[PDB]
């Protein structure tokens, strides 16, 4: 609705000093011809200069020299706030000096060769930060701000004095790129970024607006996350977007200096941050300054931790200063800092999922010059355990092997052709596959949080189980009003039991997928690790994480692992009590339903699970997953072969008909054996025909007809010739007895 | 400020601490506050160095030089008592201690009031309901919750106003208010900073929450109520109070629901400890913590210290046969020691509970200890009526359903089973309501009837149908063999 809130679009006058008009808009403005109009955009950098060299284009979209997009803006679709501010002072003059592309060739004076013919009767109505193109030649070189005799911008005049003693730069350009980093650059963490924005942007932009209510803003934020996730870029991008100041503190850099000099820098940091407008302080590798005091032994260490604490306690809320710190884990710093008034809010970064890795590949892949076969999606999905720095390494590896293996006899010779052939250079899928061959991910041990994609199309039947699940997880998160009306206490668990590998792990994920909620899976080996290692404190981390990421279906399978470890039902002299079970019970008893975190369990031998966990306030529910009946195996098969070709001579319904009861993994084994037979037959036929072509000197005999690009009935018939009923009837009867009489 | 003192140089640290007391002595009756004493005088086993002890010594000597003629008093803040050098916890030094604790439902209400003064609330804001459902919070979490709700209101309401710079912002802040949904959302994303600490407060459960047990009530009132009112009778007849009682019977028949009751009738605090803590101190082999509980029980008196699942450790090493050993362990020994080293004149009571009494060490039933055994039996006629009325008092109910009929149909049941029946009925009601609502919504959607008003909940309450469906799947959670075994345990108390 703001009248001067209008889009900006393409421009044709290669000189940036021109700014457009829109006569219907000029009638709205007081836009006068002369020196300058203040056209305001983002990050406070503007493109202020002479005006009215436009009205060639349509209205509602101001024509602004494209070079004022990289500056003052980012892309199209933006909006300008054009408001005149002509008649600026006439100081001495504005800086003259190039930046990047002038040392390449004759330099002379850098003013009187190429740039002099442009400050003619248009004597630079400018604003420091306006960047453009000006030359007396190839017509592509920048003109940047270096000096400032008058603080505000002016209109130059002859007879002045200029010193091109300055040198064109390039490292300065990299620094400018750091300033340039913005929301689109950082990728792979969307949900996390939204919280930081809603936390820091609103207090910053309008301080008095948030102060009027007077509620407390946050003083410090602590970011978790393994290395390489990208945390410096987040802080720099936030600072760039809020147009505020910044200050960086490196822990190792602080610790290197002398004992006496260590505190001076840390005091100066806060002092400088206090002398400016709303600013943000960043500390990287906090563990190097304030680790757990049990490890540290000395005098300087505590004498610096105390300084950090006292400085953090002297803000007073009237300075509009906020601090963010980077640390690997929460249980890695002195708990003194994790207190109110000190660091009190925490945000975890995590590990990018399949969606985020696609964004990271995109931001990195800009100069790749890819081919059609490059399927970035397939590349991203098969990238388990990588982080924001491993992907860059993978891209570099693929690119450099392309360079070498292709120009194995070109790049070795010195000649400009190298650059030329770089234009001819490209990248193929095989390069990416090969590079993925030698990729050692830096994180394959960390607990995984994400939304599994498994849908019930992946498992056919279990209708009543579907209904019960939707009752237990779906309905509560939609209509709490019904619980309020009838005063109801949600149930917080459910227990499974039945034969082995009948899809239990394939159901929990399913509900999460229908709930769009994350999921976490923990198996028996971890239970054995914390048993033998006798470290059950880890059980507090899992739950803690489950609390941060909610909702989650925390799934425990092979619950009977520890029970069977000390024998079966008879077991040892003891009963059915252990340590990890006690910690599980404690955490369950100390959890609030109002965070919507669900717990699921699984086991094959339910007779050897402690009954101490089936009382109210706990699972208190038992569900039995039976052997698949008719046409459930049909859906299982369709899921199995949906990634492999199949002919029509084979009918999955026939395979289902032949079997009279089977487990879940056995059908997968049958399909895999059929695939193995197909692969062997194809390879053998191909090699035999290749040998025929070799021994026979038929220099030209073209024949490309794969005898088996698919699968036939024969493969499945041979598979049927060797198969198992993996479960005996005695187990079925035992489960029937376990059903008891449910009166 | 402790950290402020520690930051300075070694030489400069003592000058400030001397100047503090010097200035305090130059004025009229004054008070000195030390925050985070742990930063200056921690347990010396942790500290290794020279400056640390050279400052603890200065603190002690300064503390010993008051002379009582200056009218100067000092208070210090510390997280726990076993966190400072015991030198300071001596006579002439710090000798009096006061525990702040964790605010209960009543206190959190006051904190909400003091914080909520510019909130500009609406009618629906029920601060009471907000306060009661605030377990585990402290004096700083409530401020954070207030801020979260306020700012969420600011954003979600002025999502297209506050983003534009204009004085109207302040003006719309006048139009700004807060709704209950904002508080509920804030409570959704609230992580309390204290959910593991022992709780001390007066439970509100009354005997209206459990109907029968007349003789049990009389004996309770004899054991806990009467002594705290007429010690003169004990003096006259020269009587020694009994300091314990033991329970035994089937599972979950209200044992936990009785101890609190007596506390409620006595307006005295209560503390509950369960088997998982016993297993934690067994496996962890840290029974010293057993001295903390009692210590706290001494500070907050009277208290009915309740131990349930006492047979947990007994069953852990098997049942009656168990292991080669008998019925002796470590935590039981510490319990016996602390009971033997306690004075009745502080009025602290101890209660126990268990389901399998045959596997509890008889070493604790001798005089000077519980020495009393009580059996809570299966509820008889109309006790289940009271338990039902307690169960559904937070839910609407129609008149077609008669709780007396439900009691009549059953011929003996546990305590939690009736709760399960009520919960299943509530689940059926919720499912039926949701299904009917969604079906009618789909009818309204598929039919382009732009205006068809009908607000008649088919079930804003519960009907019998739900209860007969519940009856169609119910369990007697306890078998008759257990009843006979308890009968044998009754033995012949000639």
Author numbering:
A (entry chain A): 21 to 763
B (entry chain F): 270 to 763
Show me the paper's own sentences about this structure.
In fact, p97/Cdc48 acts as an unfoldase that couples the extraction of proteins from membranes and complexes to ATP hydrolysis. p97/Cdc48 is classified as type II AAA ATPase, as each protomer contains two consecutive ATPase modules and assembles to a homohexamer with a two stacked rings architecture. The NTDs are essential for the recruitment of most cofactors, as well as for substrate binding, whereas the ATPase domains regulate ATP binding and hydrolysis, controlling cofactors binding and substrate processing.
We generated three mutants of the human p97: F266A (D1), F539A (D2) and the double mutant F266A F539A (D1 & D2). To structurally study the effects of the D1/D2 mutations on p97 we used single particle cryo-EM on both the single (F266A, D1) and the double (F266A F539A, D1-D2) mutated proteins and obtained 3D reconstitutions at 2.7 Å and 3.4 Å, respectively. The D2 rings aligned with the ADP conformation. (E) The D2 ring pore loop 1 (P545-N558) of p97 F266A and p97 F266A F539A double mutant also resemble the ADP state, as evident from the pore dimension and the interactions between neighboring subunits constituting the pore. The strong structural similarity of these mutants is in line with the similar effect they had on the growth rates, pQC capacity and UN binding affinity. Three conclusions may be deduced from these findings: (1) The D1 (F266A) mutation is dominant over the D2 (F539) mutation and thus imposes on the double mutant the same conformation as was determined for the F266A mutant. This conclusion is in line with the very minor phenotype both the F266A mutation and the double mutation (F266A F539A) had on the functionality of these mutants in cells, as well as the lack of significant effect when substituting the wild type CDC48 in yeast. The deduced Gibbs free energy of p97 F266A F539A upon UN binding (ΔΔG2−14−3=−388±350calmol), represents the coupling energy between the two phenylalanine side chains and is in line with coordination during the structural transition associated with UN binding, indicative of cooperativity between the D1 and the D2 rings.
